[PDB]
Amino acid sequence: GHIEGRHANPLAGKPFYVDPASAAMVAARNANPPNAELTSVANTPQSYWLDQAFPPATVGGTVARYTGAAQAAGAMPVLTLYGIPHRDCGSYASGGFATGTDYRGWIDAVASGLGSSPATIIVEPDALAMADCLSPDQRQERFDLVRYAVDTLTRDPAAAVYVDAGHSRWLSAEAMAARLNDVGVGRARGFSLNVSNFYTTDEEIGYGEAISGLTNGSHYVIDTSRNGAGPAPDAPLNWCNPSGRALGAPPTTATAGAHADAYLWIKRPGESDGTCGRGEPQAGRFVSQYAIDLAHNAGQ
């Protein structure tokens, strides 16, 4: 018979993968007595963050294991790549690979691990948005590395690749669209917004629709992990372990934006944002109280 042409949202059609070994799951299983907040969080699909702790020599196997496990679960894995050189401009989440050559080798290995398997990839939270901390030449290098990630990862046809694009109160839509266009967003599925932040979904839809229009109709995802109460009052460090924040909409493709492929939990609720001027836990360390606070503040 006839073969139809292609129609669609790559994120629609199977559930997002719940990592069975996340820090939240470990905490939920250990809670004595059981805790409603922790269990809820642990059972919500999030994203699996990879960085320079996973060397190029071995990260391919790590990626293949994770994507293969998700496939065995009938689910879409979400992976967050967070290895850019000069990561976080040397602030609380400092890290990343030492050099661009190492980063390129890492990307090559990630792509090898992906093969042809389904995956959603969030490329480098903050890298484009924060790039002005770098000199002109290191900024250009960074853009070239993000472009390298797009060009290399998209060789997995089943990888839905979203380049991180900051949020609605970071760069302007015009400034961020220019960076996304420079790194080849047209070859990706699109971009991500609100990662590790707290802005309302509605505000992020308006911003994402604007960037989409400036990037030839690209699509986007919004991190709704911690945005159920919107942001804390405008202040320095209001993004760094703020109190009073709530879990947002659980991950879904039933979104309210014309080009919004999904609401995802990209940040993992419970992880510290950093020491934050208060001696709080190192960035990325899981704090059960933080996950419980987010769930309590959402009324759970």
PDB file of C-alpha atoms in Angstrom:
ATOM      1  CA  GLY A   1       0.000   0.000   0.000  1.00  0.00           C
ATOM      2  CA  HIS A   2       0.518   3.734   0.001  1.00  0.00           C
ATOM      3  CA  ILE A   3       2.966   5.175   2.542  1.00  0.00           C
ATOM      4  CA  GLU A   4       1.924   8.470   4.192  1.00  0.00           C
ATOM      5  CA  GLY A   5       4.252  11.402   4.563  1.00  0.00           C
ATOM      6  CA  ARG A   6       5.282  12.453   8.069  1.00  0.00           C
ATOM      7  CA  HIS A   7       2.925  14.502  10.298  1.00  0.00           C
ATOM      8  CA  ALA A   8       4.198  15.672  15.343  1.00  0.00           C
ATOM      9  CA  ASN A   9       5.407  16.049  18.933  1.00  0.00           C
ATOM     10  CA  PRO A  10       8.253  13.532  19.570  1.00  0.00           C
ATOM     11  CA  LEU A  11       7.446  13.618  23.277  1.00  0.00           C
ATOM     12  CA  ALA A  12       3.829  12.459  22.911  1.00  0.00           C
ATOM     13  CA  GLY A  13       2.968   8.778  22.985  1.00  0.00           C
ATOM     14  CA  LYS A  14       4.687   7.113  25.890  1.00  0.00           C
ATOM     15  CA  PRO A  15       5.253   8.114  29.489  1.00  0.00           C
ATOM     16  CA  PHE A  16       8.418   9.792  30.623  1.00  0.00           C
ATOM     17  CA  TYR A  17      10.846   7.460  32.361  1.00  0.00           C
ATOM     18  CA  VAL A  18      10.942   7.396  36.159  1.00  0.00           C
ATOM     19  CA  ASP A  19      14.520   6.793  37.299  1.00  0.00           C
ATOM     20  CA  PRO A  20      14.277   3.860  39.744  1.00  0.00           C
ATOM     21  CA  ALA A  21      17.574   4.757  41.442  1.00  0.00           C
ATOM     22  CA  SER A  22      17.221   8.516  41.896  1.00  0.00           C
ATOM     23  CA  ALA A  23      18.170  10.147  45.175  1.00  0.00           C
ATOM     24  CA  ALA A  24      14.458  10.868  45.690  1.00  0.00           C
ATOM     25  CA  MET A  25      13.594   7.192  45.261  1.00  0.00           C
ATOM     26  CA  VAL A  26      16.312   6.186  47.711  1.00  0.00           C
ATOM     27  CA  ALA A  27      14.960   8.721  50.222  1.00  0.00           C
ATOM     28  CA  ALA A  28      11.330   7.667  49.687  1.00  0.00           C
ATOM     29  CA  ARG A  29      12.178   4.003  50.189  1.00  0.00           C
ATOM     30  CA  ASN A  30      14.183   4.807  53.363  1.00  0.00           C
ATOM     31  CA  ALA A  31      11.586   7.034  54.992  1.00  0.00           C
ATOM     32  CA  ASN A  32      10.399   5.563  58.257  1.00  0.00           C
ATOM     33  CA  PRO A  33       7.477   6.007  58.405  1.00  0.00           C
ATOM     34  CA  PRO A  34       6.714   6.387  54.711  1.00  0.00           C
ATOM     35  CA  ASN A  35       6.477  10.044  53.615  1.00  0.00           C
ATOM     36  CA  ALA A  36       3.744  11.137  51.173  1.00  0.00           C
ATOM     37  CA  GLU A  37       5.792  14.060  49.831  1.00  0.00           C
ATOM     38  CA  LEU A  38       8.913  12.050  49.093  1.00  0.00           C
ATOM     39  CA  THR A  39       7.043   9.195  47.496  1.00  0.00           C
ATOM     40  CA  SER A  40       5.136  11.542  45.201  1.00  0.00           C
ATOM     41  CA  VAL A  41       8.334  13.252  44.066  1.00  0.00           C
ATOM     42  CA  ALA A  42      10.215   9.968  43.624  1.00  0.00           C
ATOM     43  CA  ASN A  43       7.450   8.583  41.401  1.00  0.00           C
ATOM     44  CA  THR A  44       7.450  11.631  39.090  1.00  0.00           C
ATOM     45  CA  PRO A  45       9.685  11.365  35.981  1.00  0.00           C
ATOM     46  CA  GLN A  46      12.562  13.841  36.025  1.00  0.00           C
ATOM     47  CA  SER A  47      15.798  14.004  34.054  1.00  0.00           C
ATOM     48  CA  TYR A  48      19.144  12.315  34.459  1.00  0.00           C
ATOM     49  CA  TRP A  49      22.024  14.792  34.664  1.00  0.00           C
ATOM     50  CA  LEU A  50      25.388  13.917  33.158  1.00  0.00           C
ATOM     51  CA  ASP A  51      28.595  15.969  33.514  1.00  0.00           C
ATOM     52  CA  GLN A  52      32.354  15.667  33.778  1.00  0.00           C
ATOM     53  CA  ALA A  53      32.012  12.936  36.407  1.00  0.00           C
ATOM     54  CA  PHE A  54      31.208  10.663  33.431  1.00  0.00           C
ATOM     55  CA  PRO A  55      34.357  10.650  31.302  1.00  0.00           C
ATOM     56  CA  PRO A  56      34.286  10.327  27.502  1.00  0.00           C
ATOM     57  CA  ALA A  57      35.835   6.878  27.896  1.00  0.00           C
ATOM     58  CA  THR A  58      32.791   5.470  29.662  1.00  0.00           C
ATOM     59  CA  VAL A  59      29.792   7.789  29.275  1.00  0.00           C
ATOM     60  CA  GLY A  60      28.590   5.978  26.151  1.00  0.00           C
ATOM     61  CA  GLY A  61      27.915   2.841  28.140  1.00  0.00           C
ATOM     62  CA  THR A  62      26.212   4.852  30.872  1.00  0.00           C
ATOM     63  CA  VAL A  63      23.927   6.467  28.269  1.00  0.00           C
ATOM     64  CA  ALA A  64      23.179   3.165  26.514  1.00  0.00           C
ATOM     65  CA  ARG A  65      22.278   1.562  29.854  1.00  0.00           C
ATOM     66  CA  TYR A  66      19.873   4.383  30.764  1.00  0.00           C
ATOM     67  CA  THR A  67      18.198   4.642  27.380  1.00  0.00           C
ATOM     68  CA  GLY A  68      17.956   0.872  27.144  1.00  0.00           C
ATOM     69  CA  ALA A  69      16.352   0.713  30.600  1.00  0.00           C
ATOM     70  CA  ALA A  70      13.832   3.357  29.577  1.00  0.00           C
ATOM     71  CA  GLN A  71      13.029   1.411  26.413  1.00  0.00           C
ATOM     72  CA  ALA A  72      12.526  -1.746  28.539  1.00  0.00           C
ATOM     73  CA  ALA A  73      10.077   0.304  30.627  1.00  0.00           C
ATOM     74  CA  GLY A  74       8.207   1.530  27.495  1.00  0.00           C
ATOM     75  CA  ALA A  75       9.146   5.077  28.422  1.00  0.00           C
ATOM     76  CA  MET A  76      10.948   8.147  27.091  1.00  0.00           C
ATOM     77  CA  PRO A  77      14.195   8.925  28.988  1.00  0.00           C
ATOM     78  CA  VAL A  78      15.125  12.560  29.583  1.00  0.00           C
ATOM     79  CA  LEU A  79      18.851  13.293  29.870  1.00  0.00           C
ATOM     80  CA  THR A  80      20.397  16.621  30.791  1.00  0.00           C
ATOM     81  CA  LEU A  81      23.918  17.324  29.531  1.00  0.00           C
ATOM     82  CA  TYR A  82      25.749  19.667  31.875  1.00  0.00           C
ATOM     83  CA  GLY A  83      29.435  19.417  30.976  1.00  0.00           C
ATOM     84  CA  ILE A  84      30.250  22.701  29.230  1.00  0.00           C
ATOM     85  CA  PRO A  85      33.719  24.161  29.897  1.00  0.00           C
ATOM     86  CA  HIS A  86      33.601  26.992  32.433  1.00  0.00           C
ATOM     87  CA  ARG A  87      30.279  25.614  33.653  1.00  0.00           C
ATOM     88  CA  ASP A  88      28.265  28.064  35.762  1.00  0.00           C
ATOM     89  CA  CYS A  89      30.966  30.685  35.207  1.00  0.00           C
ATOM     90  CA  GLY A  90      32.730  29.239  38.245  1.00  0.00           C
ATOM     91  CA  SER A  91      29.845  29.842  40.697  1.00  0.00           C
ATOM     92  CA  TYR A  92      28.006  27.332  42.927  1.00  0.00           C
ATOM     93  CA  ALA A  93      27.607  24.737  40.152  1.00  0.00           C
ATOM     94  CA  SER A  94      31.156  25.077  38.848  1.00  0.00           C
ATOM     95  CA  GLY A  95      32.494  22.116  36.872  1.00  0.00           C
ATOM     96  CA  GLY A  96      32.426  20.976  33.297  1.00  0.00           C
ATOM     97  CA  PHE A  97      35.149  19.568  31.130  1.00  0.00           C
ATOM     98  CA  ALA A  98      38.502  21.329  31.081  1.00  0.00           C
ATOM     99  CA  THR A  99      38.716  22.051  27.380  1.00  0.00           C
ATOM    100  CA  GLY A 100      36.646  22.141  24.246  1.00  0.00           C
ATOM    101  CA  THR A 101      38.499  19.103  22.924  1.00  0.00           C
ATOM    102  CA  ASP A 102      37.376  17.119  25.936  1.00  0.00           C
ATOM    103  CA  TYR A 103      33.807  18.358  25.584  1.00  0.00           C
ATOM    104  CA  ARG A 104      33.724  17.305  21.924  1.00  0.00           C
ATOM    105  CA  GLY A 105      35.004  13.843  22.854  1.00  0.00           C
ATOM    106  CA  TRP A 106      32.326  13.619  25.517  1.00  0.00           C
ATOM    107  CA  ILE A 107      29.587  14.502  23.055  1.00  0.00           C
ATOM    108  CA  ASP A 108      30.899  11.923  20.616  1.00  0.00           C
ATOM    109  CA  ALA A 109      30.648   9.292  23.348  1.00  0.00           C
ATOM    110  CA  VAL A 110      27.162  10.356  24.405  1.00  0.00           C
ATOM    111  CA  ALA A 111      26.030  10.104  20.788  1.00  0.00           C
ATOM    112  CA  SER A 112      27.588   6.633  20.528  1.00  0.00           C
ATOM    113  CA  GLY A 113      25.629   5.539  23.571  1.00  0.00           C
ATOM    114  CA  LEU A 114      22.357   6.948  22.227  1.00  0.00           C
ATOM    115  CA  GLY A 115      22.663   4.979  18.981  1.00  0.00           C
ATOM    116  CA  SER A 116      19.180   4.997  17.393  1.00  0.00           C
ATOM    117  CA  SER A 117      17.314   4.841  20.711  1.00  0.00           C
ATOM    118  CA  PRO A 118      14.585   7.216  21.848  1.00  0.00           C
ATOM    119  CA  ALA A 119      15.751  10.000  24.137  1.00  0.00           C
ATOM    120  CA  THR A 120      15.013  13.581  25.091  1.00  0.00           C
ATOM    121  CA  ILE A 121      18.185  15.611  25.533  1.00  0.00           C
ATOM    122  CA  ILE A 122      18.395  18.939  27.362  1.00  0.00           C
ATOM    123  CA  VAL A 123      21.620  20.501  26.104  1.00  0.00           C
ATOM    124  CA  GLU A 124      23.583  22.552  28.629  1.00  0.00           C
ATOM    125  CA  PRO A 125      21.340  24.421  31.077  1.00  0.00           C
ATOM    126  CA  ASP A 126      22.476  28.052  31.251  1.00  0.00           C
ATOM    127  CA  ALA A 127      25.303  27.781  28.724  1.00  0.00           C
ATOM    128  CA  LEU A 128      23.919  30.144  26.116  1.00  0.00           C
ATOM    129  CA  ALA A 129      22.179  32.403  28.645  1.00  0.00           C
ATOM    130  CA  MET A 130      25.248  32.842  30.843  1.00  0.00           C
ATOM    131  CA  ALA A 131      27.833  33.014  28.020  1.00  0.00           C
ATOM    132  CA  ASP A 132      28.525  36.749  28.428  1.00  0.00           C
ATOM    133  CA  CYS A 133      30.616  35.915  31.535  1.00  0.00           C
ATOM    134  CA  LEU A 134      33.205  34.685  29.072  1.00  0.00           C
ATOM    135  CA  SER A 135      35.593  36.675  26.902  1.00  0.00           C
ATOM    136  CA  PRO A 136      34.570  37.111  23.262  1.00  0.00           C
ATOM    137  CA  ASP A 137      36.730  34.228  22.125  1.00  0.00           C
ATOM    138  CA  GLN A 138      35.686  31.836  24.895  1.00  0.00           C
ATOM    139  CA  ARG A 139      32.072  32.794  24.217  1.00  0.00           C
ATOM    140  CA  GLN A 140      32.488  31.903  20.570  1.00  0.00           C
ATOM    141  CA  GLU A 141      34.088  28.601  21.600  1.00  0.00           C
ATOM    142  CA  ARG A 142      31.104  27.897  23.806  1.00  0.00           C
ATOM    143  CA  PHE A 143      28.685  28.583  20.962  1.00  0.00           C
ATOM    144  CA  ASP A 144      30.739  26.273  18.718  1.00  0.00           C
ATOM    145  CA  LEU A 145      30.561  23.517  21.369  1.00  0.00           C
ATOM    146  CA  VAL A 146      26.782  23.815  21.714  1.00  0.00           C
ATOM    147  CA  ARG A 147      26.496  23.684  17.920  1.00  0.00           C
ATOM    148  CA  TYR A 148      28.734  20.587  17.972  1.00  0.00           C
ATOM    149  CA  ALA A 149      26.350  18.980  20.449  1.00  0.00           C
ATOM    150  CA  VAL A 150      23.382  19.721  18.201  1.00  0.00           C
ATOM    151  CA  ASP A 151      25.089  18.434  15.072  1.00  0.00           C
ATOM    152  CA  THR A 152      26.377  15.275  16.711  1.00  0.00           C
ATOM    153  CA  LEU A 153      23.482  14.268  18.959  1.00  0.00           C
ATOM    154  CA  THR A 154      20.863  14.684  16.244  1.00  0.00           C
ATOM    155  CA  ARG A 155      22.461  11.819  14.321  1.00  0.00           C
ATOM    156  CA  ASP A 156      20.248   9.681  16.574  1.00  0.00           C
ATOM    157  CA  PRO A 157      16.968  10.264  14.661  1.00  0.00           C
ATOM    158  CA  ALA A 158      15.034   9.318  17.783  1.00  0.00           C
ATOM    159  CA  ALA A 159      16.752  11.951  19.951  1.00  0.00           C
ATOM    160  CA  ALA A 160      14.521  14.962  20.649  1.00  0.00           C
ATOM    161  CA  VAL A 161      17.151  17.627  21.299  1.00  0.00           C
ATOM    162  CA  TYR A 162      16.377  20.880  23.111  1.00  0.00           C
ATOM    163  CA  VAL A 163      19.107  23.516  23.503  1.00  0.00           C
ATOM    164  CA  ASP A 164      18.797  25.362  26.778  1.00  0.00           C
ATOM    165  CA  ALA A 165      17.650  28.944  26.317  1.00  0.00           C
ATOM    166  CA  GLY A 166      17.473  30.418  29.837  1.00  0.00           C
ATOM    167  CA  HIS A 167      14.185  31.932  30.929  1.00  0.00           C
ATOM    168  CA  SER A 168      11.890  34.894  30.422  1.00  0.00           C
ATOM    169  CA  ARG A 169      13.826  37.186  32.787  1.00  0.00           C
ATOM    170  CA  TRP A 170      17.327  36.358  31.572  1.00  0.00           C
ATOM    171  CA  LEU A 171      18.171  37.309  27.954  1.00  0.00           C
ATOM    172  CA  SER A 172      15.595  38.966  25.767  1.00  0.00           C
ATOM    173  CA  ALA A 173      13.784  36.781  23.256  1.00  0.00           C
ATOM    174  CA  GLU A 174      15.676  38.530  20.443  1.00  0.00           C
ATOM    175  CA  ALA A 175      19.071  38.031  22.080  1.00  0.00           C
ATOM    176  CA  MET A 176      18.426  34.380  22.880  1.00  0.00           C
ATOM    177  CA  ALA A 177      16.933  33.636  19.469  1.00  0.00           C
ATOM    178  CA  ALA A 178      20.094  35.007  17.862  1.00  0.00           C
ATOM    179  CA  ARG A 179      22.191  32.590  19.923  1.00  0.00           C
ATOM    180  CA  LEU A 180      19.900  29.654  19.217  1.00  0.00           C
ATOM    181  CA  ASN A 181      20.041  30.415  15.498  1.00  0.00           C
ATOM    182  CA  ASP A 182      23.825  30.622  15.671  1.00  0.00           C
ATOM    183  CA  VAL A 183      24.101  27.141  17.217  1.00  0.00           C
ATOM    184  CA  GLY A 184      21.748  25.543  14.716  1.00  0.00           C
ATOM    185  CA  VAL A 185      18.489  25.275  16.618  1.00  0.00           C
ATOM    186  CA  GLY A 186      16.788  24.465  13.300  1.00  0.00           C
ATOM    187  CA  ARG A 187      18.563  21.115  13.286  1.00  0.00           C
ATOM    188  CA  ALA A 188      17.324  20.368  16.818  1.00  0.00           C
ATOM    189  CA  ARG A 189      13.735  20.025  17.978  1.00  0.00           C
ATOM    190  CA  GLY A 190      14.100  23.386  19.740  1.00  0.00           C
ATOM    191  CA  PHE A 191      14.927  24.747  23.164  1.00  0.00           C
ATOM    192  CA  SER A 192      14.304  24.502  26.913  1.00  0.00           C
ATOM    193  CA  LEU A 193      13.141  27.157  29.380  1.00  0.00           C
ATOM    194  CA  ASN A 194      13.020  27.696  33.136  1.00  0.00           C
ATOM    195  CA  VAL A 195      15.516  24.934  33.978  1.00  0.00           C
ATOM    196  CA  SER A 196      16.210  25.073  37.729  1.00  0.00           C
ATOM    197  CA  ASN A 197      14.085  28.227  37.954  1.00  0.00           C
ATOM    198  CA  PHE A 198      10.653  29.202  39.186  1.00  0.00           C
ATOM    199  CA  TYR A 199       8.844  31.421  36.676  1.00  0.00           C
ATOM    200  CA  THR A 200       5.231  30.680  35.926  1.00  0.00           C
ATOM    201  CA  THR A 201       4.326  28.404  33.045  1.00  0.00           C
ATOM    202  CA  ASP A 202       2.251  31.170  31.508  1.00  0.00           C
ATOM    203  CA  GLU A 203       5.129  33.595  31.512  1.00  0.00           C
ATOM    204  CA  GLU A 204       7.388  30.947  29.954  1.00  0.00           C
ATOM    205  CA  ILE A 205       4.846  30.100  27.239  1.00  0.00           C
ATOM    206  CA  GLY A 206       4.720  33.711  26.161  1.00  0.00           C
ATOM    207  CA  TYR A 207       8.520  33.852  26.041  1.00  0.00           C
ATOM    208  CA  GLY A 208       8.792  30.494  24.264  1.00  0.00           C
ATOM    209  CA  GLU A 209       6.231  31.445  21.644  1.00  0.00           C
ATOM    210  CA  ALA A 210       8.235  34.608  20.976  1.00  0.00           C
ATOM    211  CA  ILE A 211      11.503  32.705  20.604  1.00  0.00           C
ATOM    212  CA  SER A 212       9.756  30.100  18.442  1.00  0.00           C
ATOM    213  CA  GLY A 213       8.623  32.845  16.070  1.00  0.00           C
ATOM    214  CA  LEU A 214      12.224  34.117  15.795  1.00  0.00           C
ATOM    215  CA  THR A 215      13.626  30.604  15.214  1.00  0.00           C
ATOM    216  CA  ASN A 216      11.451  29.403  12.314  1.00  0.00           C
ATOM    217  CA  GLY A 217       8.837  27.744  14.447  1.00  0.00           C
ATOM    218  CA  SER A 218      11.005  25.711  16.779  1.00  0.00           C
ATOM    219  CA  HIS A 219       9.454  23.871  19.717  1.00  0.00           C
ATOM    220  CA  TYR A 220      10.231  23.977  23.412  1.00  0.00           C
ATOM    221  CA  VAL A 221       9.894  22.419  26.819  1.00  0.00           C
ATOM    222  CA  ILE A 222       9.369  24.211  30.162  1.00  0.00           C
ATOM    223  CA  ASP A 223      10.798  23.008  33.474  1.00  0.00           C
ATOM    224  CA  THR A 224       7.782  22.963  35.828  1.00  0.00           C
ATOM    225  CA  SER A 225       9.592  21.236  38.694  1.00  0.00           C
ATOM    226  CA  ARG A 226       9.433  24.203  41.067  1.00  0.00           C
ATOM    227  CA  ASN A 227       7.147  26.798  39.508  1.00  0.00           C
ATOM    228  CA  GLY A 228       3.757  26.058  41.091  1.00  0.00           C
ATOM    229  CA  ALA A 229       3.918  29.252  43.195  1.00  0.00           C
ATOM    230  CA  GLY A 230       5.934  31.274  40.727  1.00  0.00           C
ATOM    231  CA  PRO A 231       9.189  32.961  41.715  1.00  0.00           C
ATOM    232  CA  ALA A 232      10.259  34.411  45.014  1.00  0.00           C
ATOM    233  CA  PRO A 233      10.373  38.242  45.181  1.00  0.00           C
ATOM    234  CA  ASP A 234      12.953  39.834  42.866  1.00  0.00           C
ATOM    235  CA  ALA A 235      16.301  39.863  44.643  1.00  0.00           C
ATOM    236  CA  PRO A 236      19.842  38.630  44.153  1.00  0.00           C
ATOM    237  CA  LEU A 237      20.036  34.950  44.807  1.00  0.00           C
ATOM    238  CA  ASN A 238      16.265  34.494  44.721  1.00  0.00           C
ATOM    239  CA  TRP A 239      16.944  31.516  42.447  1.00  0.00           C
ATOM    240  CA  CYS A 240      19.271  29.877  45.010  1.00  0.00           C
ATOM    241  CA  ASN A 241      17.323  27.594  47.391  1.00  0.00           C
ATOM    242  CA  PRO A 242      14.467  30.063  47.848  1.00  0.00           C
ATOM    243  CA  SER A 243      11.795  29.190  50.361  1.00  0.00           C
ATOM    244  CA  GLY A 244       8.105  29.135  49.706  1.00  0.00           C
ATOM    245  CA  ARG A 245       8.325  27.557  46.226  1.00  0.00           C
ATOM    246  CA  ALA A 246       6.019  24.762  45.123  1.00  0.00           C
ATOM    247  CA  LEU A 247       6.100  21.813  42.768  1.00  0.00           C
ATOM    248  CA  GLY A 248       4.571  22.754  39.426  1.00  0.00           C
ATOM    249  CA  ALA A 249       2.555  20.791  36.927  1.00  0.00           C
ATOM    250  CA  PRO A 250       3.616  17.195  36.653  1.00  0.00           C
ATOM    251  CA  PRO A 251       5.339  16.281  33.379  1.00  0.00           C
ATOM    252  CA  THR A 252       2.919  16.162  30.463  1.00  0.00           C
ATOM    253  CA  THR A 253       2.523  16.875  26.775  1.00  0.00           C
ATOM    254  CA  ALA A 254      -0.910  18.428  27.399  1.00  0.00           C
ATOM    255  CA  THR A 255       0.435  21.976  27.372  1.00  0.00           C
ATOM    256  CA  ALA A 256      -1.072  25.431  26.815  1.00  0.00           C
ATOM    257  CA  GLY A 257       1.496  26.661  24.283  1.00  0.00           C
ATOM    258  CA  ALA A 258       1.205  26.166  20.517  1.00  0.00           C
ATOM    259  CA  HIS A 259       4.885  25.153  20.296  1.00  0.00           C
ATOM    260  CA  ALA A 260       5.273  23.748  23.825  1.00  0.00           C
ATOM    261  CA  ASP A 261       6.046  20.038  23.406  1.00  0.00           C
ATOM    262  CA  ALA A 262       5.989  19.361  27.162  1.00  0.00           C
ATOM    263  CA  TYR A 263       6.186  20.441  30.730  1.00  0.00           C
ATOM    264  CA  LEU A 264       9.094  18.458  32.198  1.00  0.00           C
ATOM    265  CA  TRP A 265      10.831  18.211  35.559  1.00  0.00           C
ATOM    266  CA  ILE A 266      14.363  18.924  34.399  1.00  0.00           C
ATOM    267  CA  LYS A 267      15.741  20.080  37.741  1.00  0.00           C
ATOM    268  CA  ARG A 268      15.274  17.282  40.280  1.00  0.00           C
ATOM    269  CA  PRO A 269      13.204  18.575  43.239  1.00  0.00           C
ATOM    270  CA  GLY A 270      15.181  18.187  46.448  1.00  0.00           C
ATOM    271  CA  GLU A 271      18.589  19.010  44.996  1.00  0.00           C
ATOM    272  CA  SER A 272      20.274  21.998  46.518  1.00  0.00           C
ATOM    273  CA  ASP A 273      20.958  24.873  44.145  1.00  0.00           C
ATOM    274  CA  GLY A 274      24.251  25.576  45.917  1.00  0.00           C
ATOM    275  CA  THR A 275      25.764  26.918  49.075  1.00  0.00           C
ATOM    276  CA  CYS A 276      23.893  30.174  48.310  1.00  0.00           C
ATOM    277  CA  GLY A 277      25.592  32.466  50.857  1.00  0.00           C
ATOM    278  CA  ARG A 278      24.228  30.421  53.720  1.00  0.00           C
ATOM    279  CA  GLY A 279      26.362  27.311  53.935  1.00  0.00           C
ATOM    280  CA  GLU A 280      23.666  25.223  52.286  1.00  0.00           C
ATOM    281  CA  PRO A 281      24.514  21.896  50.640  1.00  0.00           C
ATOM    282  CA  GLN A 282      26.666  21.785  47.519  1.00  0.00           C
ATOM    283  CA  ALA A 283      24.819  22.212  44.248  1.00  0.00           C
ATOM    284  CA  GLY A 284      23.170  18.971  43.192  1.00  0.00           C
ATOM    285  CA  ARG A 285      23.137  17.313  46.603  1.00  0.00           C
ATOM    286  CA  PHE A 286      19.744  15.868  47.441  1.00  0.00           C
ATOM    287  CA  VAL A 287      18.049  17.278  50.541  1.00  0.00           C
ATOM    288  CA  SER A 288      14.872  15.458  51.531  1.00  0.00           C
ATOM    289  CA  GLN A 289      13.592  18.536  53.333  1.00  0.00           C
ATOM    290  CA  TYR A 290      13.791  20.561  50.140  1.00  0.00           C
ATOM    291  CA  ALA A 291      11.683  18.025  48.208  1.00  0.00           C
ATOM    292  CA  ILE A 292       9.193  17.850  51.073  1.00  0.00           C
ATOM    293  CA  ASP A 293       8.966  21.646  51.262  1.00  0.00           C
ATOM    294  CA  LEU A 294       8.181  21.856  47.535  1.00  0.00           C
ATOM    295  CA  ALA A 295       5.460  19.241  47.882  1.00  0.00           C
ATOM    296  CA  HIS A 296       4.015  20.833  51.088  1.00  0.00           C
ATOM    297  CA  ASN A 297       3.922  24.186  49.436  1.00  0.00           C
ATOM    298  CA  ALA A 298       1.939  22.581  46.566  1.00  0.00           C
ATOM    299  CA  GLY A 299      -0.598  21.418  49.198  1.00  0.00           C
ATOM    300  CA  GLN A 300       0.618  17.809  49.393  1.00  0.00           C
TER     301      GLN A 300
END
